[PDB]
Amino acid sequence: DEPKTDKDVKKLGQDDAGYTIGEEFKWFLKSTIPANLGDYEKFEITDKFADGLTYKSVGKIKIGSKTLNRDEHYTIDEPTVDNQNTLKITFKPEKFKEIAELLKGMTLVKNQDALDKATANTDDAAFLEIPVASTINEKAVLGKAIENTFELQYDHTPDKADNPKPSNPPRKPEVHTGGKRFVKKDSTETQTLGGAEFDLLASDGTAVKWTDALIKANTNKNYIAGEAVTGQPIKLKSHTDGTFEIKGLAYAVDANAEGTAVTYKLKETKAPEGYVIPDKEIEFTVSQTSYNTKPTDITVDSADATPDTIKNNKR
Numbered sequence: 001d002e003p004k005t006d007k008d009v010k011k012l013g014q015d016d017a018g019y020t021i022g023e024e025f026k027w028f029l030k031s032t033i034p035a036n037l038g039d040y041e042k043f044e045i046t047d048k049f050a051d052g053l054t055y056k057s058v059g060k061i062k063i064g065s066k067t068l069n070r071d072e073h074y075t076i077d078e079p080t081v082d083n084q085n086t087l088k089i090t091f092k093p094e095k096f097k098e099i100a101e102l103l104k105g106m107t108l109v110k111n112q113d114a115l116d117k118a119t120a121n122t123d124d125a126a127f128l129e130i131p132v133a134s135t136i137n138e139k140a141v142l143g144k145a146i147e148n149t150f151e152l153q154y155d156h157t158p159d160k161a162d163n164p165k166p167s168n169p170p171r172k173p174e175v176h177t178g179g180k181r182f183v184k185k186d187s188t189e190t191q192t193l194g195g196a197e198f199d200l201l202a203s204d205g206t207a208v209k210w211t212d213a214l215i216k217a218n219t220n221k222n223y224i225a226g227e228a229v230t231g232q233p234i235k236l237k238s239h240t241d242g243t244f245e246i247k248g249l250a251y252a253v254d255a256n257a258e259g260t261a262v263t264y265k266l267k268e269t270k271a272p273e274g275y276v277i278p279d280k281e282i283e284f285t286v287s288q289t290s291y292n293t294k295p296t297d298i299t300v301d302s303a304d305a306t307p308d309t310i311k312n313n314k315r
Ligand SMILES: [Ca+2]
Pocket: 006, 007, 008, 013, 014, 015, 116, 171, 172, 173
């Protein structure tokens, strides 16, 4: 009857997701609920978040359809620099009976596999669900899985002895973000061309906008056309050596860190002096290896992937 635990990302049942830096998403810390929860003398969850994740908030803690209330049923200690980005959630031992009473008409999820596979949390199949809002920040390595887990310390014995045991997710969820490098050249890929300007767009043509975290991930001002401001469209520029890049775009959106690449596009709004503005957007893809060749082998970007050459035609 003792707790089994699991962690998900994006939505219940999902273990892998890809994000653009600064986009807020949820982790889900999950536990089965013991039938004898009323007896428990400790129920405390600790989550040390990787450096490349920024904690945002804790959502509504749910068991089946019902919500537990902050500072009434549990207490939160938030991630800070001082505690090495660590979240703690402490369920109040003196509320263990009250919480158990809330569970009365619910059918409880029992075993690990069912917890792992759950895509919903309902009265008919209930468990403890802790959504934690998070972003991937500028400290991420492009193409590198960022894992998360937690540990539950539970005391199931109502014996007045402080003797908790651990419960740990057997398998860990992860997120990832990517990038791309470019070089602007003439029509035969000979001369490098400075001063081209591009709007960064999603594949459907929606402009990608700055957020403060994404701004912090794109610190080389030579590659940015004008000022970067949160909420405004991303505009890139080729440097005097023809080069530019974009760092922190989603790929493998619903897959592991090796998963499906995502297409983005560039609208050339200004051509190098003497050259023509094209009608058609230039596409590129972001993948695990489109910025770093070997992201599993590093803790900071190498930026060694082969840039895409973008051609320009003469006036
Ligand atoms: Ca999971």
